Amino acid sequence: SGFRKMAFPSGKVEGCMVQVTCGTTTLNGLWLDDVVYCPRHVICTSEDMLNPNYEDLLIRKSNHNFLVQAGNVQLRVIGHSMQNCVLKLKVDTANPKTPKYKFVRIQPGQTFSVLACYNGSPSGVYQCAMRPNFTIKGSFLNGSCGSVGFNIDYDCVSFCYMHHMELPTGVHAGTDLEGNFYGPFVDRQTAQAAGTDTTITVNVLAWLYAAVINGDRWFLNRFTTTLNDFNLVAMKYNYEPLTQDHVDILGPLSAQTGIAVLDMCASLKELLQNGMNGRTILGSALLEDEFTPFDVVRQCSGVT
Amino acid sequence: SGFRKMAFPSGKVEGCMVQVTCGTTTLNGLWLDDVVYCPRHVICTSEDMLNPNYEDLLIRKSNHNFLVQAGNVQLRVIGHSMQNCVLKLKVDTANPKTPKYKFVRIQPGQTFSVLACYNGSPSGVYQCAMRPNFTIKGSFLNGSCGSVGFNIDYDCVSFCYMHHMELPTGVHAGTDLEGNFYGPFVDRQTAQAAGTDTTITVNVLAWLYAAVINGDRWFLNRFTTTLNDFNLVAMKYNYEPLTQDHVDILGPLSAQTGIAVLDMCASLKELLQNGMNGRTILGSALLEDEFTPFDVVRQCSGVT
Ligand SMILES: COc1ccccc1OCCNC(=O)c1cc(=O)[nH]c2ccccc12
Ligand SMILES: COc1ccccc1OCCNC(=O)c1cc(=O)[nH]c2ccccc12
C-alpha cells in the first residue's frame, strides 16, 4: 500500500547523457547509437535567441564546433544535421550503454519521467505529465536544456520529451525526439503564452481508484451520473471532457474496485462541487491528475 | 523554475539490486562488494512471522539455502551472518557495479530516495522522508522488502534505509543498513501502532523559501514572531518544535530570499491559523514537509 509520484528507474537514461558545447553555450545531449541529440538552440548566443534564423546560424558551424563529452572523455563529431528543432550530431563511437529504445510523441494527459541534467550529468528524476496546453510543469534551471522525458516498458526506453525552454510563466516547453515542439511553442525568446491548463479528468479518476485501492474511501458517495451530466460539471471546473475511450481505459480499475466508472464520476462531481472540506486523499488536499490509469495499475501491481 | 518532488538518479543503486530467495520467500537484496544485504525475515514462512525466533530459524539454514540471482545469473553464497535485523550473505564475486558508498543512519525529518524493487528488479523511484514517528510513507507491495533508501553526494551513495514491513495502518517500517529498525518497530507480525505523525517544521519552512524563490509569494505577510511564540502555534498544530539549529540551517535560504527566518515563521503561523483559503503553494493545497533545506538548495541550484 501507499501511493507515490513514482518515476521510472533512471539508470538506462543516465548512461545516455552527454554534455554538448557550442561556442560559449553548454547544454545536455542524448547519445543513442552513434548519434547525439540536443536542442538546436545550442548554436545560439543570447542575442540570437530573440529572433534566431537557425539555418543561417548553422552554416557558420562545423563538426569541430560541437564539443561532445561523455563522462570525462571527448567524442569525435563526424556529422551534423538539423531535424526540426533538434540537432543530430553523428559521432564516431556508438554509445556502449545504448538501451533498447524508441522515439514516441505522446498526447496530453500522458505522464513520463524526466531526468534533469546539467553539464551532461544527471541531478534528479521526477514524474511529469504533458499538460492539455502542451506545457509541462517541470523543475529546470539554466543548463537543463537537452534533459529528456521517457517511459520504460521492461527494458525498452521510449523517449518522448527533450527540454528546450522555460516560458515567462515558469512552465516548460520542449519537443519530441524528432525535434517537433509539443504545442504551438517555438524556440525563440518571444511572448509565448500558454493556453488553459485544464485538469486531466481520466487521470483524476484513475487516482481516485488508486485511493480506493489504498484504503482512502471517504469521498465515495451514494450517487451515479451519466457521461453528459458529468461533462457539464467538468466543463464548469476546467476539467477535460471524459469520453467513452476514457471509460474503457478505466475498465480494469473499475473491475478491481467494484466501482462503476460513472459512480466514481459522481464522486468526483461531488468533490468538485463541495470541495475537500479540509480532508485529504492519498496525502493530497487537491485532486491529483498526473497519474494515468496505466500508472495506477503499474504501481498498484508491481511492474518491473 | 518549478519545484518537484525529485528523487536522486537511481542508476548507481539499480546496479546493486539482486533477488534473494530462501525456501518459498523471494525478496530483494543489496549487493555491495562481496556482500548481499537483505531483511532477515527472508528465512520466515508466513506462520513464522507471527512470533519468529530468528536465531533458531537461522540454524536450519545453510549457505546453499540462500539463492542470490543478479540479473539472470546465480551468485555463489560462501558465508552468511545475521547483523541485527539484516542478513549479510557473503558471495564469491564482488559486485562489479559497486559504487562508492556509505551506510548512514538518518534522523527524522531527513529525506531520501527509494528504489522500489520486486524480484531484484527496480520498478520505480520516489522521494520519501523519515517521519518523526520513524515510519516512512512509501509505496510498497508484496515482494518489495529489501528495497533501499539512499542519498547521493556526487558519486557516493549513502544507503540509509532497507524496507522490511508494512504496518496495519499502511505506513512502512525498516532498518538502516546495519539492521537496526528506525523507531520501535520489530520484524514480527504483531500490533505495532505508530506514534503521532507530526509535521517537519524546518522542512515546511524550507519549502516556503522554495516557493518564494519560484515566484509563489501570496502567503508572505507583514508579520514576524519569536521562536517561542511560533512553537506555541506549532505545538497546537502537531508541528515539530523549531530550534535555533533549524534557524541556522535555514540561514542560506533566508539570505537568498532576503526573508528573515522568523518572518517566514510568522507567515507559516498565519497559514496554520487561517488555512490556504482554496489557494495553492507550488501546486499543493497543503504545506509540504518532505523537502529539507538541503534539498531546496540542491534543487534550486542544480547540484549533480
Ligand atoms: C527564453 O529562453 C529560451 C527561449 C527559446 C529557446 C530556448 C531558450 O532558452 C535556452 C536556455 N534556457 C535555459 O537554460 C533554462 C531552461 C529552463 O527550463 N529554466 C531556466 C531557468 C533559468 C535560466 C535558464 C533556464
Ligand atoms: C506483517 O508483515 C511483516 C511483519 C514483520 C516483518 C515482515 C513482514 O512482512 C514481510 C513481507 N511483506 C511484504 O512483502 C510487504 C511489504 C510492504 O511494504 N507492503 C506489502 C503489501 C502487501 C503485501 C505485502 C507487503
Domains of chain A: 1-14+100-197 (2.40.10.10), 15-99 (2.40.10.10), 198-301 (1.10.1840.10)
Cβ contacts of residue A147 below 8 Å, gap of 6+?
A28, A114, A115, A116, A117, A140, A162, A163
* Helix pair angle (A261-274, A201-213), 10° resolution: 100
- Which residue, A56, A71, A13, A2, is CA-closest to A37? A13
DSSP SS3 for A28: strand
Contact B304 A137 (CB under 8 A): no
Tell me the resolution in Å.
1.6
User: Could you tell me the three cell numbers for B35?
Assistant: 556482500
Kindly calculate the radius of gyration of chain A based on its CA atoms and give it in whole angstroms.
21
Cell numbers 572523455 label which residue? Answer: A73
Give the three cell numbers for residue A95: 554509445
Residue with cell 545475521: B82
Pairing of strands B156-166, B100-103: parallel
- Rounded distance, CA B77 to CA B56, Å? 20
Which residues pair with residue A281 across a beta bridge?
Answer: A284
| CA pair distance B270, B189, nearest whole angstrom | 43
For chain B, what is the total number of helices (H) and then of strands (E)?
A: 8, 13
- Method for structure elucidation: X-ray
Are A200 and A290 contacting, i.e. CB atoms less than 8 angstroms apart? yes
Residues with CB under 6 A from ligand 1: A 41, 49, 140-145, 164-166, 172, 187-189; B 1
Compute the Cα dihedral for A51, A55, A59, A65 and give only its sign. Answer: positive
- Tell me if B187 CB under 6 Å of ligand 2: yes
Residue A41 annotated in active site: yes
Whether B145 is catalytic is yes
Angle of helix A261-274 relative to helix A227-236, nearest 10 degrees, comes to 30
Joined grid coordinates for residue B80: 552468511
Could you give the CA distance from residue A272 to residue A275 in angstroms, rounded to a whole number? 5
CB atoms within 10 A of CB B102: 13
Check if the beta carbon of residue A113 is closer than 8 Å to that of residue A122.
no
CB B122 within 8 A of CB B10: yes
How many CA atoms lie within 13 Å of B251's alpha carbon, on the beta-carbon side?
5
Supply the DSSP symbol for B142: T
Chain B neighbors of A170, CB-CB under 8 A: 1-2, 214-215
- Whether A272 contacts A208, CB under 8 Å: no
Q: How far apart are CA A234 and CA A242, in angstroms?
A: 8
- Calculated CA dihedral for residues B292, B296, B301, B304, nearest 10 degrees: 50
β-strand partners of B161: B149
Task: Specify the DSSP class assigned to residue A124.
Answer: E
- The set of residues, in sequence order, having a beta carbon less than 8 Å from that of B6 and lying 6+ positions away, is A116, A124, A125, A126, A139, B127, B295, B299
Alpha-carbon gap, residue B277 to B298, rounded angstroms:
30
For residue B57, the surrounding DSSP H or E stretch is helix B54-59
Q: What are the residues facing B130 on neighbouring strands?
A: none
User: Cβ–Cβ contacts within 10 Å for residue B235, how many?
Assistant: 12
> Out of B128, B145, B160, B265, which one is annotated catalytic?
B145
Cα B282 → chain centroid: 22
- Taking the C-alpha atoms of residue B192 and residue B184, their distance in angstroms, rounded to an integer, is 9
- Look up residue A94 and give its three cell numbers: 556508438
DSSP state of A30: E
H/E element, B166: strand B156-166
Residue B77, SS3 per DSSP: strand
Nearest to A107 by CA among A299, A209, A243, A234: A243
Nearest chain B residue to A5 by CA distance is B126
